[PDB]
Amino acid sequence: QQVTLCEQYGYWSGNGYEINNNLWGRDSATSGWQCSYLDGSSDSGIQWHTTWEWQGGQHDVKSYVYSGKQFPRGQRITSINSMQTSVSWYYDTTNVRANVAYDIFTAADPNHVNSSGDYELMIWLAKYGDVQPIGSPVGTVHVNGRNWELWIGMNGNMKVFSFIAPSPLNSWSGEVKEFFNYLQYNQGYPAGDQHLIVFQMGTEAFTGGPATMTVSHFSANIY
Numbered sequence: 396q397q398v399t400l401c402e403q404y405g406y407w408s409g410n411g412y413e414i415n416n417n418l419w420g421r422d423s424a425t426s427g428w429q430c431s432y433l434d435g436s437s438d439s440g441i442q443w444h445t446t447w448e449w450q451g452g453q454h455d456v457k458s459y460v461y462s463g464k465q466f467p468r469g470q471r472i473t474s475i476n477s478m479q480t481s482v483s484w485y486y487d488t489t490n491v492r493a494n495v496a497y498d499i500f501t502a503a504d505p506n507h508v509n510s511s512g513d514y515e516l517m518i519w520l521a522k523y524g525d526v527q528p529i530g531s532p533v534g535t536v537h538v539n540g541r542n543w544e545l546w547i548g549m550n551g552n553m554k555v556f557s558f559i560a561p562s563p564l565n566s567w568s569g570e571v572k573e574f575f576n577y578l579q580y581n582q583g584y585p586a587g588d589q590h591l592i593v594f595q596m597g598t599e600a601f602t603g604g605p606a607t608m609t610v611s612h613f614s615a616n617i618y
């Protein structure tokens with residue numbers, strides 16, 4: 396690959412995108428490893444993959460390696476007109492306990508650290524094994540032309556909304572503002588007080604492997 400990132404928090408940035416080998420929960424594993432690899436990048440999007448094996452810590456996330464879209468701090472959610480994104484990905488085996496998910500943090504403080512926020516929005520395009528989102532499911536919702544099981548919970552003082560696809564969506568073209576709109580008018584989410592902190596796509600790895608997730612394309616367009 397063009398770039399290989401095997402260290403915890405190994406980082407690449409280019410073309411308005413970034414990759415982080417974000418092995419934040421590796422201390423929960425009894426054994427394992429993970430690397431992320433850049434295959435290509437342009438202003439129109441990036442291609443990357445990650446390979447991993449993790450054992451132990453059955454219900455603990457070991458990592459959420461991701462590609463992130465970069466943008467200026469200070470964008471209030473209600474000031475954002477569109478948060479379109481396109482992704483195509485595939486796992487080489489589904490015999491893993493892992494998900495594929497977008498992760499978005501928002502915070503009243505526009506300069507909030509990138510590792511959390513006041514609120515978290517996850518969109519799970521796939522769920523392999525018995526792994527569960529934070530909190531409890533509240534029912535099925537229709538957002539951006541598709542149905543999702545909505546889970547709501549707390550991670551410390553951070554409120555987490557997770558939208559779960561009913562079957563794996565290997566190719567997805569989404570408008571993430573529709574999810575914020577849904578939360579603003581159905582879950583009391585204070586969109587006018589919140590700023591965008593991160594916008595990421597990746598995989599939460601729990602156990603299994605060796606396995607590879609290939610992202611044939613990732614792009615996002617915020618305006």
Ligand SMILES: OC[C@H]1O[C@@H](O[C@H]2[C@H](O)[C@H](O)[C@H](O[C@@H]3[C@H](O)[C@H](O[C@H]4[C@H](O)[C@H](O)[C@H](O)O[C@@H]4CO)O[C@H](CO)[C@H]3O)O[C@@H]2CO)[C@@H](O)[C@@H](O)[C@@H]1O
Binds near residue numbers: 406419555
């Ligand atoms: O940006 C470059 C610098 O990276 C730094 O490492 C940061 C890194 O940027 C990561 O984004 C990481 O954030 C962690 C996770 O993303 C995770 O988010 C969890 C979240 O808690 C939710 O509950 C949800 O369910 O899942 C997501 C994804 O699993 O949360 C963990 C724990 O709070 C975050 O740490 O943080 C890294 C470490 O700070 C630096 O390493 C620096 O060197 C780079 O320049």
